[PDB]
Design a protein around this ligand. Structure first.
Ligand SMILES: Nc1ncnc2c1ncn2[C@@H]1O[C@H](COP(=O)(O)OP(=O)(O)OP(=O)(O)O)[C@@H](O)[C@H]1O
Ligand SMILES: [Ca+2]
Lengths: 22, 364
């Protein structure tokens, strides 16, 4: 992206996430 | 799942596809397309090899790179219409590519997705990166090894480092070959009709990596500690010993299939050495492994040992072998696509209609 938007995406990633289980 | 995002990871050997938000690919099928050998008009996947006998089979993906665009189309069609049972035009679709994918390829792919499939939005992400993401990191060095190729990919803050990428044209497709070879050199008649299939199952069931190859050989020479058995369907049972660990050893010693290339430990070390001296610390302590060819028991610790020996004595090394690394890449994508800070990163059909296929190349 190249702005003050890449850092939040990054931060969000490291945060983690749950994934609907099949 | 409708109006949701699609994730599609196209390996050299395997296609993984599903829905963003899901913990796993709903669809995993062979990356091959077969057309009538002589004269319906096309087959893909399991059904294509089911009828290999009357078709010319082909692999659109060679070395992780797309080489046959027509066949690749048939794969994507089969993915949407026949596997996921969805309509492309109502699902943003994330796709994956190999490190060092030529720009003309990426654009050709973006161009098809829009003009031919008419997906509302799309994104192309580098496979190795997704693996890294899947582990919850944005900095580290990935070892991705699938069916066709192996890469070392150094990544710093979400961006890969192209100058430092190491490619190795040695993966599972040739390891299965190697094993098929040896097995036979001991009186086991193996061909391709259906054998090739068994040889692969033996590979994933019985092969493992020795922590010390020289040392492990001596063990399998002085006892039957390491023998294991496999009953073919025919009935004929067969026993394996040192073959269980000699096959994967090819990853550390390519000179086993006569490749004068260097092993994955070396290329991993060389890849890091190719990077900024200030980020090596971060990299050494973040080896993330992905791909189905990294699934061998013992590979994590062998790597840990090998790298500790190549690197400075003071550096802390660390290998991360997710039990789900067979599907890391796809999972990595599944995660990304679902995140909200990502929803602005999509390439829209609108954006494409204004600029052109080139609207899919950013730096930084
Ligand atoms: N348990 C296992 N042990 C050893 N090898 C395995 C195991 N499971 C899968 N593999 C191998 O992993 C390979 C497929 O992995 P993967 O789907 O990551 O590759 P791909 O993406 O299709 O190809 P590439 O990434 O090389 O383009 C197959 O060759 C298979 O033999
Ligand atoms: Ca792959």
């Amino acid at each position: 992206s190249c702005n003050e938007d890449h850092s939040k995406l990054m931060e969000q990633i490291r945060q983690g996430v749950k994934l609907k289980s099949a | 799942d409708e109006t949701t995002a699609l994730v599609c990871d196209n390996g050299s050997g395997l296609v993984k596809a599903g829905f963003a938000g899901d913990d796993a690919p709903r669809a995993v099928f062979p990356s091959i397309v077969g057309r009538p050998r002589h004269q319906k008009d096309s087959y893909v996947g399991d059904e294509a090899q089911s009828k290999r006998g009357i078709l010319t089979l082909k692999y659109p993906i060679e070395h992780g790179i797309i080489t046959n665009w027509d066949d690749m189309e048939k794969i994507w069609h089969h993915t949407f219409y026949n596997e996921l049972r969805v309509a492309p035009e109502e699902h943003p679709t994330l796709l994956t590519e190999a490190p060092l994918n030529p720009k003309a390829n990426r654009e050709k792919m973006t161009q098809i997705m829009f003009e031919t499939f008419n997906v509302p939005a799309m994104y192309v992400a580098i496979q190795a990166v997704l693996s890294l993401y899947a582990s919850g990191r944005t900095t580290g060095i990935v070892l991705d090894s699938g069916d066709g190729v192996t890469h070392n990919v150094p990544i710093y803050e979400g961006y890969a480092l192209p100058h430092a990428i190491m490619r190795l044209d040695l993966a599972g497709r040739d390891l299965t070959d190697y094993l098929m070879k040896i097995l036979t050199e001991r009186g086991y008649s193996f061909v391709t009709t259906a054998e090739r299939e068994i040889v692969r199952d033996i590979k994933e069931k019985l092969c493992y990596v020795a922590l010390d190859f020289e040392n492990e050989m001596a063990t399998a020479a002085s006892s039957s500690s390491l023998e294991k058995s496999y009953e073919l369907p025919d009935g004929q049972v067969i026993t394996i010993g040192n073959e269980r660990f000699r096959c994967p050893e090819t990853l550390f010693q390519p000179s086993f299939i006569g490749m004068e290339s260097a092993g994955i430990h070396e290329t991993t070390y060389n890849s890091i050495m190719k990077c900024d001296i200030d980020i090596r610390k971060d990299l050494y302590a973040n080896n993330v492994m992905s791909g189905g060819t990294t699934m061998y028991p013992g590979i994590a610790d062998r790597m840990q040992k090998e790298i500790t020996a190549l690197a400075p004595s003071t550096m802390k090394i660390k290998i991360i072998a997710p039990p789900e690394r067979k599907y890391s890449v796809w999972i990595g994508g599944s995660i990304l696509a679902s995140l909200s800070t990502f929803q602005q990163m999509w390439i829209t059909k609108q954006e494409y209609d204004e600029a052109g296929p080139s609207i899919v190349h950013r730096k930084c």
